[PDB]
Design a protein around this ligand. Structure first.
Ligand SMILES: [Cl-]
Ligand SMILES: [Cl-]
Ligand SMILES: [Cl-]
Ligand SMILES: [Cl-]
Lengths: 253, 253, 253, 253
């Protein structure tokens, strides 16, 4: 069927918790075997087990998405185990809040590396194998509303996410001919454990509700449909697009 | 389930053939009851007949999408029959090929009215009823690659489709608060009977293939996934967005 | 000289008052002979005299920009004398505030005709002559922040202005080969007559200042530079672009 | 006066040759004192000595735009003397052509550092001073057509230029309140030394001319107006915008 992922294997980076974990559970529910990833082995193992206990075919491979050596070692392990990555979601990346005039280069660099460079490095390894197998493939990059409009105090993130939007186009340009579709999801303001300080702040909550015409935050499960869509046959002729899931935020002045 | 349309009734304008017909068949396959509309009543009945014979729950209502009196009469009839339109796809619109300096006002106007005003009028009637029911709803407008970049000789269409892109944002702005999601699809170059002169031209075919990195035309069934996506629970937190289905055309310089 | 408009004749529609008047004054100050057009003949003559008193070479031609016969008659007069319109600014267009579910078709249509259709008709007449003279030309359409993001209660204006954005791309597509550059200005929230109600509402004022990082409304003379820029040799290789003048509004999430 | 830069000092990075040198000469001609920059000192000297003999107020400061210690040294120096940088053009950056599957991380990183990180670092030093002085400022980042649409084989450049487009929005977002306007120029295909290979290839020349409706390459001085525009009072209410100078390329499907 159109949205069925049975027979496919997905790898989601930074998926021990947060939205990454939600993508992974969501793809599993659509029938994919899923491989979770995080830098912390022990945490990753707990998240893998939680999905296994739900009846999903879940696995974990721990690696630093900024370390090209670790990345290729991970894909070589997967190779040896006969595991083909058909779907990749590049969800890894950090946040750093600081005005630009006060921003340390080291922090700028870490945001760019974990958010933008990581997507190149992981996609490079995954796409090579998709190409070699002639199996086709799906690559989903994670953008942000900041792929389109900036937020003060998160400049390197904003720059990285604008870069992710265009990197998505480059992957379409170079790989679509091999039946690989690379697209992006741009999540709006979503209730996560990480955002909990934002949701708890009455002023910030009011601002979110007045900025999106849906008048509410999104929940992580509301991103699942878009992940499955962009991972399935339903998106075979979609390439280089970013889909914002923001209840209407970017649409409104 | 996430992409199941069982229990939902969809109205697709200009769906006697071409892309509109494909949306109607796609929604029906996902479980929707479908109401086809065209201005050509005899053609419409034939198309409805075709779908019923494949085992789909299909019906036809013929009306001019530029005639608000005809639209309200059509919706009133549906009301009297206990039929609730939960999904609206505004696919109606004509094309007219002529350079602007040679373009007569009546033809400019016919393109704007059938493409842009039609989406306002049909949506107004549909949205009024979705709001009064507090049933929620889905509205999908049909843009084009010309919602983003222009082609010579099709200016009023281009203008109309740029207008559709922003009208979609307006519908997000005004109706998202009533749990109505209004989004748009921008089809790329798709093989349909109407485009047959384009496909049969060697030069034009080569240009299409060298302009999209997928190196091929799309088929109408490759738009169905997006239509179901935007008509289903999967798009509950998506609003005011246009999704291009073009094999990567817009992504590449 | 790069930003000098001496020797050029510009026509500006809807220029009896507001931003249209400011555009006319600005082009004159840069050296252009200016022809002001409006449907309101009385104060049109008043505005022309004001510019004349200031030392500028201003003239008035009153006609309805939605009446193709009046347009052709006005240009035919300009033809019978030796007046070449080298620069056209399509500033004409009305506003109408009303939620879509309460919006009468009559008013939707008047907004579309006066904003979008007017720009096609006036440019068609102007471009034809520019092409025949083969002396190049400049056409500047007037968009809005709503060419990119919507506001509730102004849907036909938003649709019209999104249409203007793409119509601008069409004019570049069809006329750039004749050395005509067609671009657009998207004004933000400016202190002008058409915004008096907005400016005097304490809440709207506060909303404008919190939404643009410049924390203030623009002034009409802050649009003049962009107009002169798009009318001058400086824009010779700029075509189909819209420049927003909004203090940073669209740039900020 | 609206476009006069007299009384302003501009710093243009990577301006020993090519478009950066053009920008420098352009600003000087509009009245600015100009400071050229490159890593190559004696080449830079030759370039400065060239402008001085044409009677421009030109100066040069040599430094690596990826080296934060060197950048501060240059400013801390200028700081130590009586030099205020009022206009900054971030033109520095390199190209690297290579398919992503064949691209070494070291080269990806060099492109990112030289194009995107450099703009952050130089702007940081400049903006801190503009803010402290409270005399306003202008910052112009250099994007590319790849800020919007990708080209195969130049992915890190495309990602960096996408990043530049959004970094520009961040600078508006954070610094517009200090009367600093940050905007970007996106040059299309321009007749320069750096494009010699491109230009003298018949196939490539043909593809450029068929892809932009002006049917020609741009000339270096056709970028000057935009740089002066964005450096002058004409742009006081423009912030976070990118202006593409491409003859209409991006406007046409
Ligand atoms: Cl005609
Ligand atoms: Cl006539
Ligand atoms: Cl009304
Ligand atoms: Cl390499």
């Amino acid at each position: 069927a159109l949205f069925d992922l049975t027979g496919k294997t997905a790898l989601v980076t930074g998926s021990a918790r947060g939205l990454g974990f939600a993508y992974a559970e969501g793809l599993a529910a659509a029938g994919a075997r899923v491989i979770l990833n995080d830098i912390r082995a022990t945490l990753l193992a707990e998240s893998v087990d939680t999905l296994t206990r739900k009846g999903y075919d879940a696995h974990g491979v721990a690696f630093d998405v900024t370390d090209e050596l670790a990345i290729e070692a991970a894909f070589s392990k997967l190779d040896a185990e006969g595991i083909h990555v058909d779907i990749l979601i590049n969800n890894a990346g950090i946040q750093y809040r600081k005005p630009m005039v006060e921003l340390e280069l080291e922090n700028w660099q870490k945001v760019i590396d974990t958010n933008l460079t990581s997507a190149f490095l992981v996609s490079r390894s995954a796409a090579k194998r998709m190409i070699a197998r002639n199996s086709g493939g799906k690559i989903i990059n994670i953008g942000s509303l900041t792929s389109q409009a900036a937020r003060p105090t998160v400049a390197p993130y904003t720059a990285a996410k604008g870069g992710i939007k265009m990197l998505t186009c480059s992957m379409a340009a170079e790989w679509a001919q091999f039946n690989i579709q690379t697209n992006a999801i741009g999540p709006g303001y979503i209730l996560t454990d990480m955002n909990t300080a934002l949701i708890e702040d009455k002023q910030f909550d009011s601002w979110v509700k007045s900025s999106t015409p849906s008048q509410r935050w999104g929940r992580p499960e509301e991103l699942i449909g878009t992940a499955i869509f962009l991972s399935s046959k339903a998106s075979d002729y979609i390439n280089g697009q970013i889909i914002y899931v923001d209840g209407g935020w970017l649409a409104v002045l």
